[PDB]
Amino acid sequence: QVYNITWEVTNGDRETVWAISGNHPLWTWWPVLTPDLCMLALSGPPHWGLEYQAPYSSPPGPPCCSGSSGSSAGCSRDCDEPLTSLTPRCNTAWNRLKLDQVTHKSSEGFYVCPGSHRPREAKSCGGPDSFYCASWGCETTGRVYWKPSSSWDYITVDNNLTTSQAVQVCKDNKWCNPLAIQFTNAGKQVTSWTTGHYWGLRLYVSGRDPGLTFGIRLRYQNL
Amino acid sequence: MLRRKVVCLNTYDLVALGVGSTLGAGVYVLAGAVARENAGPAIVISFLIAALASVLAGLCYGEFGARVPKTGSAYLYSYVTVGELWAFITGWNLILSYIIGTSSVARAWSATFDELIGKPIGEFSRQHMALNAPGVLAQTPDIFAVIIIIILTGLLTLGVKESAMVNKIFTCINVLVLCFIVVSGFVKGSIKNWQLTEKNFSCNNNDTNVKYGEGGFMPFGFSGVLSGAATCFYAFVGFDCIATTGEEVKNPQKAIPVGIVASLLICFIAYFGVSAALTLMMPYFCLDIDSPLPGAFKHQGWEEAKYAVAIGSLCALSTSLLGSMFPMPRVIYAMAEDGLLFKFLAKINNRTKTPVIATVTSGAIAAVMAFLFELKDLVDLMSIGTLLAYSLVAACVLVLRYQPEQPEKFSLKSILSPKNVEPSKFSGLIVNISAGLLAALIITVCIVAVLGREALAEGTLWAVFVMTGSVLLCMLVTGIIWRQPESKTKLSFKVPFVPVLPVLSIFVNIYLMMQLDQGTWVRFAVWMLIGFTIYFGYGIWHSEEA
Ligand SMILES: *[C@@H]1O[C@H](CO[C@@H]2O[C@@H](C)[C@@H](O)[C@@H](O)[C@@H]2O)[C@@H](O[C@@H]2O[C@H](CO)[C@@H](O[C@@H]3O[C@H](CO)[C@@H](O)[C@H](O[C@H]4O[C@H](CO)[C@@H](O)[C@H](O)[C@@H]4O)[C@@H]3O)[C@H](O)[C@H]2NC(C)=O)[C@H](O)[C@H]1NC(C)=O
Ligand SMILES: *[C@@H]1O[C@H](CO)[C@@H](O[C@@H]2O[C@H](CO)[C@@H](O[C@@H]3O[C@H](CO)[C@@H](O)[C@H](O)[C@@H]3O)[C@H](O)[C@H]2NC(C)=O)[C@H](O)[C@H]1NC(C)=O
Ligand SMILES: CC(C)CCC[C@@H](C)[C@H]1CC[C@H]2[C@@H]3CC=C4C[C@@H](OC(=O)CCC(=O)O)CC[C@]4(C)[C@H]3CC[C@]12C
Ligand SMILES: CC(C)CCC[C@@H](C)[C@H]1CC[C@H]2[C@@H]3CC=C4C[C@@H](OC(=O)CCC(=O)O)CC[C@]4(C)[C@H]3CC[C@]12C
Ligand SMILES: *[C@@H]1O[C@H](CO)[C@@H](O[C@@H]2O[C@H](CO)[C@@H](O)[C@H](O)[C@H]2NC(C)=O)[C@H](O)[C@H]1NC(C)=O
Ligand SMILES: *[C@@H]1O[C@H](CO)[C@@H](O)[C@H](O)[C@H]1NC(C)=O
Ligand SMILES: NC(=[NH2+])NCCC[C@H](N)C(=O)O
């Protein structure tokens, strides 16, 4: 029968940061989850600058003077200045622009590795602190030149908006790093989503490759 | 092209002269601009690099003046030691340095004075003047800077000279004001301003188009810090006056290097303290565009202190201004008397007994530059000129150490393992060639590290290959210079590590020059084109040694 189904995307602390809902039979609705990469970082690792931000909180940082709202008191011109020195993070609009550039540059990007649902043979992939990406080959999906894929991983993660579509959204001081998560055939065949399955996401940059941990779970009720 | 010429005050007096001629617009006006635009709280680091780059240069001067019994500007030393073309380039760069320094300091003094009285002169300028070319010219011409330059040029023409007592008094007042600024920053200022985040990216004033950057201590990154250091090299200029003192010194060549180094160290300490105070009292982004230090004092509630600072700055900006003007006619007169420049510039007026025409021409050029170009543009132009001059001095120090005492085919064994105990003409030629190749290779290294910075970060094969080859071949050429014997001539002062320290000085100077803007490079290129035209059309044929 039909239930009110709800797919939830939660941060590393297992607090729901994004959600979508619909009336469907159980295990028949597999929508494209579009959480913001910054939403996953809310109350997350210190690098993203959102370790003290609650879920569903508004994007921090002053607006860009180039935004649709125009110039205002204390508006920032960093969104027009070069993004070279900027660190890819989510605490300001220009930092979000830098994060978008990093995730959209061919030589750079982000890669995702699976968590507790990975096979025992991958147990050498590290713990949550390592983001389950202790070494190359553990990654199962992500947007990067080597284009990783897995025949058993339950999701594939890519960039939802192209750079051009996202620059203006960033300059409007909105969440402007929307991921695109698509359930694989293996994921569609899986039923344990009620308990939640968790992945780690790390940026491919020249340095620490800082990352975070996110999760996808299912809730449902009668409708 | 390579024709060569035939050649009291205590150390504390030299230190006072250097400090008075160095402290000025760099700290009172430009420190806030650098801490707001290029660097943040990390401007303290920016000065440090700018200090070291200066010290490396100053040390060279100590040796570069030790090889000439006569005391004079770097132009005289070059024209006595290396050659005519090299000396002309050095003197032309010094002329640019002095002229643009006069222009920039006159502008800073005019802006400070106009601020002190409510910007009435600026209001008149906006009302009645406009250049209609913000892309390359100033938003508002500085008529008062022109007036100041005219008055000071008139004073200089009528025989006004350096008053040591007045310089000491003004330097003491400025140093007292700077110490007060440091103490007030350490008292009122807080470390939290060095740890700002997006929570604090707001200004009480409702100015727009702010650059907040990353925040914290290094909002704009190490690239921003390096650009700030290149700009802050403006502040450390002015120690050449110690080498060009002219007046008799207790130690002809031992006190001069000590005085230069002590002045540079004192200036670095003062700049570090004042910049730390400025960035601790007020947020780096909040720093007032018109007057950073008074704005920070007002932000902390000590508005009255704006008077004290006004007393200090106007003193420093005065001592610095003359420090950039008194040498200005001297270099032009020296070059003209030698025939490199137009001979009419060397005619000394009988009534005044001074080079009236050279002083008037230099003053007019400085007044026009101050009228037409912004403070930052003139600052960068003088910085590039002075950096090239200092690199030339360092190259002279590197070269002369291995040349034989004056009155082609080669072999690998001779080049790498010379057996002569003292330099020969072959060794001197090897060192000259190695210096040229090392200069070219350092230019290549800096170009790839600046222009190809992102490419190097990306790891592209061509950029990495070029950088690696250039750096390793720089090391190889430095070793080649190392193996050559040094001149046995005894010198009162020597650069300790002559094979490395001059090379590092050249590299740092060229890197800082690369940090500058494209417009600065275009202005410098046109100035150098004018200088080369003058030399090759007039200088070579009318030289006094011809
Ligand atoms: C089908 O189910 C969805 C989702 O169910 C929700 O999650 C379940 C796990 C369970 O806890 C349910 O109780 C819960 O409702 C329903 O959509 C939710 O509807 C409620 C209201 O009925 C929303 O509650 C909140 O109410 C606040 C005011 O009191 C309001 O400010 C909230 O908006 C803000 O917060 C939400 C997240 O809470 C955020 O998504 C918004 O964008 C906004 O910031 C919100 O309205 C829930 O938020 C709704 N969604 C979720 C994921 O909880 C849906 O109504 C239901 N439909 C039927 C026909 O049954
Ligand atoms: C993530 O990617 C999806 C897919 O590209 C985006 O969904 C798209 O959003 C745009 C803008 O809302 C939709 O355009 C609209 O189309 C309708 C007709 O369907 C038209 O009437 C509207 O005027 C508007 O042009 C587009 O249809 C929609 N596409 C899909 C497949 O859903 C989404 O916006 C991206 N961002 C996020 C946060 O999900
Ligand atoms: C109607 C106009 C003239 C009003 C504008 C104010 C003037 C009275 C100002 C503008 C420039 C000032 C001068 C700028 C610099 C100096 C140098 C200063 O001397 C030093 O600092 C000596 C240091 C050294 O010799 O190295 C003495 C004051 C003086 C002449 C100032 C005197 C007052 C002047 C002429
Ligand atoms: C006075 C004597 C006793 C010591 C002289 C030491 C100097 C030769 C050293 C001290 C600090 C050094 C500088 C420290 C940092 C840099 C930055 C470096 O460039 C980068 O690291 C760029 C990185 C980026 O691309 O962001 C180029 C050399 C330079 C200027 C160094 C040049 C050599 C310096 C001036
Ligand atoms: C920058 O902003 C932060 C957060 O607003 C300030 O930190 C808090 O300030 C409040 C006062 O407004 C104090 O009560 C808290 O104890 C501070 N710390 C917290 C909340 O962790 C900080 O003071 C601001 N800094 C500056 C220089 O303005
Ligand atoms: C802030 O803006 C108001 C007008 O909205 C203006 O009156 C005020 O002077 C501004 N604050 C300044 C200039 O410090
Ligand atoms: N001798 C010079 N060229 N000096 C020009 C002025 C630079 C001086 N260091 C200042 O702080 O303003």
PDB file of N, CA and C in Angstrom, chain B residues 262-336:
ATOM      1  N   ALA B 262      71.492  49.358  11.468  1.00  0.00           N
ATOM      2  CA  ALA B 262      70.767  49.766  12.666  1.00  0.00           C
ATOM      3  C   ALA B 262      69.497  50.526  12.308  1.00  0.00           C
ATOM      4  N   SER B 263      69.574  51.417  11.315  1.00  0.00           N
ATOM      5  CA  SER B 263      68.385  52.144  10.888  1.00  0.00           C
ATOM      6  C   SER B 263      67.331  51.192  10.343  1.00  0.00           C
ATOM      7  N   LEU B 264      67.749  50.214   9.535  1.00  0.00           N
ATOM      8  CA  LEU B 264      66.792  49.254   8.997  1.00  0.00           C
ATOM      9  C   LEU B 264      66.149  48.436  10.110  1.00  0.00           C
ATOM     10  N   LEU B 265      66.940  48.012  11.098  1.00  0.00           N
ATOM     11  CA  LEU B 265      66.384  47.236  12.204  1.00  0.00           C
ATOM     12  C   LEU B 265      65.398  48.063  13.021  1.00  0.00           C
ATOM     13  N   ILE B 266      65.745  49.320  13.309  1.00  0.00           N
ATOM     14  CA  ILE B 266      64.844  50.182  14.069  1.00  0.00           C
ATOM     15  C   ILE B 266      63.554  50.411  13.294  1.00  0.00           C
ATOM     16  N   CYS B 267      63.669  50.654  11.987  1.00  0.00           N
ATOM     17  CA  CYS B 267      62.482  50.854  11.165  1.00  0.00           C
ATOM     18  C   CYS B 267      61.618  49.602  11.137  1.00  0.00           C
ATOM     19  N   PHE B 268      62.240  48.424  11.046  1.00  0.00           N
ATOM     20  CA  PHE B 268      61.470  47.187  11.078  1.00  0.00           C
ATOM     21  C   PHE B 268      60.738  47.027  12.401  1.00  0.00           C
ATOM     22  N   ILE B 269      61.413  47.313  13.515  1.00  0.00           N
ATOM     23  CA  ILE B 269      60.764  47.195  14.819  1.00  0.00           C
ATOM     24  C   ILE B 269      59.573  48.142  14.898  1.00  0.00           C
ATOM     25  N   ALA B 270      59.775  49.394  14.479  1.00  0.00           N
ATOM     26  CA  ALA B 270      58.698  50.376  14.538  1.00  0.00           C
ATOM     27  C   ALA B 270      57.529  49.964  13.652  1.00  0.00           C
ATOM     28  N   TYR B 271      57.815  49.506  12.432  1.00  0.00           N
ATOM     29  CA  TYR B 271      56.748  49.101  11.523  1.00  0.00           C
ATOM     30  C   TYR B 271      55.991  47.899  12.066  1.00  0.00           C
ATOM     31  N   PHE B 272      56.710  46.899  12.580  1.00  0.00           N
ATOM     32  CA  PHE B 272      56.052  45.737  13.166  1.00  0.00           C
ATOM     33  C   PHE B 272      55.123  46.162  14.293  1.00  0.00           C
ATOM     34  N   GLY B 273      55.635  46.957  15.234  1.00  0.00           N
ATOM     35  CA  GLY B 273      54.810  47.379  16.353  1.00  0.00           C
ATOM     36  C   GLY B 273      53.598  48.179  15.918  1.00  0.00           C
ATOM     37  N   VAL B 274      53.796  49.135  15.008  1.00  0.00           N
ATOM     38  CA  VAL B 274      52.705  50.018  14.613  1.00  0.00           C
ATOM     39  C   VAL B 274      51.652  49.253  13.822  1.00  0.00           C
ATOM     40  N   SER B 275      52.078  48.366  12.919  1.00  0.00           N
ATOM     41  CA  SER B 275      51.117  47.580  12.154  1.00  0.00           C
ATOM     42  C   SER B 275      50.353  46.617  13.054  1.00  0.00           C
ATOM     43  N   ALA B 276      51.038  45.994  14.018  1.00  0.00           N
ATOM     44  CA  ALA B 276      50.339  45.134  14.965  1.00  0.00           C
ATOM     45  C   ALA B 276      49.318  45.929  15.766  1.00  0.00           C
ATOM     46  N   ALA B 277      49.695  47.127  16.219  1.00  0.00           N
ATOM     47  CA  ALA B 277      48.755  47.972  16.946  1.00  0.00           C
ATOM     48  C   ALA B 277      47.558  48.338  16.078  1.00  0.00           C
ATOM     49  N   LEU B 278      47.808  48.694  14.816  1.00  0.00           N
ATOM     50  CA  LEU B 278      46.725  49.091  13.925  1.00  0.00           C
ATOM     51  C   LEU B 278      45.763  47.937  13.676  1.00  0.00           C
ATOM     52  N   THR B 279      46.294  46.733  13.448  1.00  0.00           N
ATOM     53  CA  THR B 279      45.443  45.583  13.168  1.00  0.00           C
ATOM     54  C   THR B 279      44.803  45.002  14.422  1.00  0.00           C
ATOM     55  N   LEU B 280      45.322  45.324  15.606  1.00  0.00           N
ATOM     56  CA  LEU B 280      44.705  44.876  16.847  1.00  0.00           C
ATOM     57  C   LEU B 280      43.645  45.842  17.354  1.00  0.00           C
ATOM     58  N   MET B 281      43.823  47.144  17.117  1.00  0.00           N
ATOM     59  CA  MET B 281      42.842  48.120  17.579  1.00  0.00           C
ATOM     60  C   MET B 281      41.582  48.084  16.725  1.00  0.00           C
ATOM     61  N   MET B 282      41.736  47.905  15.417  1.00  0.00           N
ATOM     62  CA  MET B 282      40.628  47.927  14.478  1.00  0.00           C
ATOM     63  C   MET B 282      40.711  46.726  13.549  1.00  0.00           C
ATOM     64  N   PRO B 283      39.569  46.198  13.103  1.00  0.00           N
ATOM     65  CA  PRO B 283      39.609  45.123  12.105  1.00  0.00           C
ATOM     66  C   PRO B 283      40.304  45.584  10.833  1.00  0.00           C
ATOM     67  N   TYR B 284      41.007  44.651  10.188  1.00  0.00           N
ATOM     68  CA  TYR B 284      41.769  44.993   8.991  1.00  0.00           C
ATOM     69  C   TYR B 284      40.862  45.562   7.903  1.00  0.00           C
ATOM     70  N   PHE B 285      39.687  44.957   7.710  1.00  0.00           N
ATOM     71  CA  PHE B 285      38.761  45.455   6.695  1.00  0.00           C
ATOM     72  C   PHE B 285      38.171  46.804   7.095  1.00  0.00           C
ATOM     73  N   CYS B 286      38.014  47.044   8.399  1.00  0.00           N
ATOM     74  CA  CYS B 286      37.413  48.296   8.855  1.00  0.00           C
ATOM     75  C   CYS B 286      38.344  49.484   8.640  1.00  0.00           C
ATOM     76  N   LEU B 287      39.652  49.235   8.540  1.00  0.00           N
ATOM     77  CA  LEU B 287      40.648  50.302   8.479  1.00  0.00           C
ATOM     78  C   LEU B 287      40.201  51.447   7.578  1.00  0.00           C
ATOM     79  N   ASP B 288      40.241  52.671   8.105  1.00  0.00           N
ATOM     80  CA  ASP B 288      39.771  53.830   7.358  1.00  0.00           C
ATOM     81  C   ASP B 288      40.625  54.053   6.116  1.00  0.00           C
ATOM     82  N   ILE B 289      39.959  54.314   4.990  1.00  0.00           N
ATOM     83  CA  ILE B 289      40.676  54.578   3.747  1.00  0.00           C
ATOM     84  C   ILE B 289      41.405  55.915   3.823  1.00  0.00           C
ATOM     85  N   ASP B 290      40.750  56.939   4.372  1.00  0.00           N
ATOM     86  CA  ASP B 290      41.343  58.271   4.400  1.00  0.00           C
ATOM     87  C   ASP B 290      42.555  58.321   5.323  1.00  0.00           C
ATOM     88  N   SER B 291      42.417  57.802   6.541  1.00  0.00           N
ATOM     89  CA  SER B 291      43.487  57.854   7.538  1.00  0.00           C
ATOM     90  C   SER B 291      43.337  56.643   8.451  1.00  0.00           C
ATOM     91  N   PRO B 292      44.170  55.608   8.274  1.00  0.00           N
ATOM     92  CA  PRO B 292      43.959  54.363   9.028  1.00  0.00           C
ATOM     93  C   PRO B 292      44.223  54.490  10.521  1.00  0.00           C
ATOM     94  N   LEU B 293      45.356  55.088  10.903  1.00  0.00           N
ATOM     95  CA  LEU B 293      45.679  55.180  12.328  1.00  0.00           C
ATOM     96  C   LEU B 293      44.686  56.054  13.082  1.00  0.00           C
ATOM     97  N   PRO B 294      44.364  57.272  12.633  1.00  0.00           N
ATOM     98  CA  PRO B 294      43.314  58.037  13.325  1.00  0.00           C
ATOM     99  C   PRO B 294      41.975  57.326  13.341  1.00  0.00           C
ATOM    100  N   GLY B 295      41.638  56.608  12.270  1.00  0.00           N
ATOM    101  CA  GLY B 295      40.396  55.854  12.263  1.00  0.00           C
ATOM    102  C   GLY B 295      40.377  54.764  13.316  1.00  0.00           C
ATOM    103  N   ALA B 296      41.495  54.051  13.468  1.00  0.00           N
ATOM    104  CA  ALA B 296      41.586  53.028  14.504  1.00  0.00           C
ATOM    105  C   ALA B 296      41.499  53.649  15.891  1.00  0.00           C
ATOM    106  N   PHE B 297      42.160  54.790  16.094  1.00  0.00           N
ATOM    107  CA  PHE B 297      42.083  55.458  17.390  1.00  0.00           C
ATOM    108  C   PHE B 297      40.653  55.883  17.703  1.00  0.00           C
ATOM    109  N   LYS B 298      39.947  56.428  16.712  1.00  0.00           N
ATOM    110  CA  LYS B 298      38.550  56.800  16.907  1.00  0.00           C
ATOM    111  C   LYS B 298      37.693  55.575  17.195  1.00  0.00           C
ATOM    112  N   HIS B 299      37.975  54.461  16.517  1.00  0.00           N
ATOM    113  CA  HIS B 299      37.195  53.244  16.717  1.00  0.00           C
ATOM    114  C   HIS B 299      37.273  52.757  18.157  1.00  0.00           C
ATOM    115  N   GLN B 300      38.408  52.966  18.820  1.00  0.00           N
ATOM    116  CA  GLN B 300      38.598  52.537  20.198  1.00  0.00           C
ATOM    117  C   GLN B 300      38.175  53.590  21.213  1.00  0.00           C
ATOM    118  N   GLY B 301      37.642  54.726  20.763  1.00  0.00           N
ATOM    119  CA  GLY B 301      37.197  55.776  21.651  1.00  0.00           C
ATOM    120  C   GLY B 301      38.228  56.842  21.952  1.00  0.00           C
ATOM    121  N   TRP B 302      39.479  56.652  21.540  1.00  0.00           N
ATOM    122  CA  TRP B 302      40.529  57.646  21.757  1.00  0.00           C
ATOM    123  C   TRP B 302      40.634  58.578  20.548  1.00  0.00           C
ATOM    124  N   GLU B 303      39.534  59.288  20.290  1.00  0.00           N
ATOM    125  CA  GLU B 303      39.490  60.189  19.144  1.00  0.00           C
ATOM    126  C   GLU B 303      40.513  61.310  19.283  1.00  0.00           C
ATOM    127  N   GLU B 304      40.713  61.809  20.506  1.00  0.00           N
ATOM    128  CA  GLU B 304      41.666  62.894  20.715  1.00  0.00           C
ATOM    129  C   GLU B 304      43.051  62.531  20.193  1.00  0.00           C
ATOM    130  N   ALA B 305      43.415  61.249  20.252  1.00  0.00           N
ATOM    131  CA  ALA B 305      44.736  60.831  19.802  1.00  0.00           C
ATOM    132  C   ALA B 305      44.978  61.181  18.341  1.00  0.00           C
ATOM    133  N   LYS B 306      43.914  61.390  17.561  1.00  0.00           N
ATOM    134  CA  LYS B 306      44.095  61.783  16.168  1.00  0.00           C
ATOM    135  C   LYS B 306      44.953  63.034  16.057  1.00  0.00           C
ATOM    136  N   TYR B 307      44.883  63.925  17.049  1.00  0.00           N
ATOM    137  CA  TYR B 307      45.773  65.082  17.055  1.00  0.00           C
ATOM    138  C   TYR B 307      47.224  64.649  17.212  1.00  0.00           C
ATOM    139  N   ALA B 308      47.508  63.823  18.222  1.00  0.00           N
ATOM    140  CA  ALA B 308      48.883  63.392  18.460  1.00  0.00           C
ATOM    141  C   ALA B 308      49.462  62.725  17.220  1.00  0.00           C
ATOM    142  N   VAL B 309      48.727  61.770  16.647  1.00  0.00           N
ATOM    143  CA  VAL B 309      49.176  61.135  15.413  1.00  0.00           C
ATOM    144  C   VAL B 309      49.422  62.188  14.343  1.00  0.00           C
ATOM    145  N   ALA B 310      48.504  63.149  14.212  1.00  0.00           N
ATOM    146  CA  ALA B 310      48.686  64.207  13.225  1.00  0.00           C
ATOM    147  C   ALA B 310      49.999  64.941  13.451  1.00  0.00           C
ATOM    148  N   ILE B 311      50.370  65.158  14.714  1.00  0.00           N
ATOM    149  CA  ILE B 311      51.655  65.788  15.004  1.00  0.00           C
ATOM    150  C   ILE B 311      52.796  64.888  14.551  1.00  0.00           C
ATOM    151  N   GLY B 312      52.692  63.587  14.827  1.00  0.00           N
ATOM    152  CA  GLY B 312      53.766  62.680  14.456  1.00  0.00           C
ATOM    153  C   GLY B 312      53.905  62.527  12.952  1.00  0.00           C
ATOM    154  N   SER B 313      52.813  62.161  12.279  1.00  0.00           N
ATOM    155  CA  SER B 313      52.881  61.904  10.844  1.00  0.00           C
ATOM    156  C   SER B 313      53.450  63.105  10.100  1.00  0.00           C
ATOM    157  N   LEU B 314      52.869  64.288  10.323  1.00  0.00           N
ATOM    158  CA  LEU B 314      53.337  65.480   9.627  1.00  0.00           C
ATOM    159  C   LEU B 314      54.821  65.714   9.862  1.00  0.00           C
ATOM    160  N   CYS B 315      55.338  65.308  11.023  1.00  0.00           N
ATOM    161  CA  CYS B 315      56.779  65.370  11.240  1.00  0.00           C
ATOM    162  C   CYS B 315      57.495  64.351  10.364  1.00  0.00           C
ATOM    163  N   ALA B 316      57.129  63.075  10.495  1.00  0.00           N
ATOM    164  CA  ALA B 316      57.783  62.037   9.704  1.00  0.00           C
ATOM    165  C   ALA B 316      57.654  62.333   8.217  1.00  0.00           C
ATOM    166  N   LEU B 317      56.425  62.576   7.755  1.00  0.00           N
ATOM    167  CA  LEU B 317      56.209  62.855   6.342  1.00  0.00           C
ATOM    168  C   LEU B 317      57.032  64.049   5.882  1.00  0.00           C
ATOM    169  N   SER B 318      57.378  64.955   6.799  1.00  0.00           N
ATOM    170  CA  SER B 318      58.285  66.041   6.450  1.00  0.00           C
ATOM    171  C   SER B 318      59.710  65.522   6.304  1.00  0.00           C
ATOM    172  N   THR B 319      60.225  64.862   7.344  1.00  0.00           N
ATOM    173  CA  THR B 319      61.606  64.390   7.302  1.00  0.00           C
ATOM    174  C   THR B 319      61.815  63.426   6.145  1.00  0.00           C
ATOM    175  N   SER B 320      60.852  62.533   5.914  1.00  0.00           N
ATOM    176  CA  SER B 320      60.934  61.654   4.754  1.00  0.00           C
ATOM    177  C   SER B 320      60.932  62.457   3.460  1.00  0.00           C
ATOM    178  N   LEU B 321      60.052  63.458   3.361  1.00  0.00           N
ATOM    179  CA  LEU B 321      59.919  64.198   2.110  1.00  0.00           C
ATOM    180  C   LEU B 321      61.249  64.817   1.703  1.00  0.00           C
ATOM    181  N   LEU B 322      61.866  65.575   2.610  1.00  0.00           N
ATOM    182  CA  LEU B 322      63.181  66.133   2.321  1.00  0.00           C
ATOM    183  C   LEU B 322      64.194  65.026   2.067  1.00  0.00           C
ATOM    184  N   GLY B 323      64.085  63.919   2.803  1.00  0.00           N
ATOM    185  CA  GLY B 323      64.976  62.798   2.563  1.00  0.00           C
ATOM    186  C   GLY B 323      64.899  62.289   1.140  1.00  0.00           C
ATOM    187  N   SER B 324      63.749  62.470   0.489  1.00  0.00           N
ATOM    188  CA  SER B 324      63.590  62.071  -0.903  1.00  0.00           C
ATOM    189  C   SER B 324      63.871  63.202  -1.881  1.00  0.00           C
ATOM    190  N   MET B 325      63.973  64.442  -1.402  1.00  0.00           N
ATOM    191  CA  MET B 325      64.173  65.594  -2.274  1.00  0.00           C
ATOM    192  C   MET B 325      65.616  66.073  -2.317  1.00  0.00           C
ATOM    193  N   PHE B 326      66.297  66.137  -1.175  1.00  0.00           N
ATOM    194  CA  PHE B 326      67.676  66.621  -1.172  1.00  0.00           C
ATOM    195  C   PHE B 326      68.573  65.816  -2.100  1.00  0.00           C
ATOM    196  N   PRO B 327      68.548  64.479  -2.092  1.00  0.00           N
ATOM    197  CA  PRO B 327      69.354  63.732  -3.071  1.00  0.00           C
ATOM    198  C   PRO B 327      68.901  63.922  -4.508  1.00  0.00           C
ATOM    199  N   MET B 328      67.674  64.394  -4.734  1.00  0.00           N
ATOM    200  CA  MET B 328      67.116  64.383  -6.086  1.00  0.00           C
ATOM    201  C   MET B 328      67.939  65.203  -7.071  1.00  0.00           C
ATOM    202  N   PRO B 329      68.302  66.461  -6.796  1.00  0.00           N
ATOM    203  CA  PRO B 329      69.138  67.195  -7.759  1.00  0.00           C
ATOM    204  C   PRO B 329      70.568  66.697  -7.817  1.00  0.00           C
ATOM    205  N   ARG B 330      71.074  66.084  -6.745  1.00  0.00           N
ATOM    206  CA  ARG B 330      72.477  65.685  -6.708  1.00  0.00           C
ATOM    207  C   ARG B 330      72.779  64.618  -7.753  1.00  0.00           C
ATOM    208  N   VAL B 331      71.916  63.606  -7.863  1.00  0.00           N
ATOM    209  CA  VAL B 331      72.149  62.539  -8.833  1.00  0.00           C
ATOM    210  C   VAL B 331      72.080  63.086 -10.253  1.00  0.00           C
ATOM    211  N   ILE B 332      71.091  63.938 -10.528  1.00  0.00           N
ATOM    212  CA  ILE B 332      70.958  64.505 -11.867  1.00  0.00           C
ATOM    213  C   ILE B 332      72.179  65.345 -12.209  1.00  0.00           C
ATOM    214  N   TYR B 333      72.648  66.157 -11.257  1.00  0.00           N
ATOM    215  CA  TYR B 333      73.834  66.967 -11.499  1.00  0.00           C
ATOM    216  C   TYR B 333      75.059  66.094 -11.735  1.00  0.00           C
ATOM    217  N   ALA B 334      75.200  65.013 -10.964  1.00  0.00           N
ATOM    218  CA  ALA B 334      76.340  64.124 -11.149  1.00  0.00           C
ATOM    219  C   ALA B 334      76.315  63.475 -12.528  1.00  0.00           C
ATOM    220  N   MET B 335      75.142  63.016 -12.968  1.00  0.00           N
ATOM    221  CA  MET B 335      75.054  62.379 -14.279  1.00  0.00           C
ATOM    222  C   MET B 335      75.288  63.386 -15.400  1.00  0.00           C
ATOM    223  N   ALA B 336      74.755  64.604 -15.262  1.00  0.00           N
ATOM    224  CA  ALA B 336      74.940  65.612 -16.301  1.00  0.00           C
ATOM    225  C   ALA B 336      76.392  66.065 -16.384  1.00  0.00           C
TER     226      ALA B 336
END
